[PDB]
Amino acid sequence: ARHETGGGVNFTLTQPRGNVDLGVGYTAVAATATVRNPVTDMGNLPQNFYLGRGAPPLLDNAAAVYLRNAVVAGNRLGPAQPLPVFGCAQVPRRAGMD
């Protein structure tokens, strides 16, 4: 197929193709062998629920927001930004880590 888009004509080659299984049983096995690298950091870091979707709070307004800013302020997790109904909890920002 040839179409004129940029600077002139453009050709697009496309080759319909198909395939089957010649095995009755399994003709191919996959293994895992080794692990290339652990993607994840792997530990020493908590859950902080003041990020995810809140809860019914402490029914004293001064109680709830004291515990909140007490826990959130120490963590590597608790978001600087207030929680928005549309969008994300917006975890805090920095420059570089380990």
């Binding site: 994840t40 997790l77 975890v91």
Partner: protein, 49 residues
């Protein structure tokens, strides 16, 4: 916990190997923390646990 997910699985030793490729989690490798997989994200971890 849920079991809708665990329920939503199969227990087929016939099938148990082919959804193994399917992963029982929803994150991506380009985030900072492992997040919930965004909708754009599609997935094929092998997810044993």
């Amino acid at each position: 916990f849920t079991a809708a997910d665990i329920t939503a699985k199969h227990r087929c030793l016939e099938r148990l190997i082919v959804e193994t490729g399917s992963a029982v989690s929803t994150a991506t490798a380009a985030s900072d923390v492992q997040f919930k997989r965004p909708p754009g994200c599609r997935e094929l971890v092998e997810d044993p646990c």
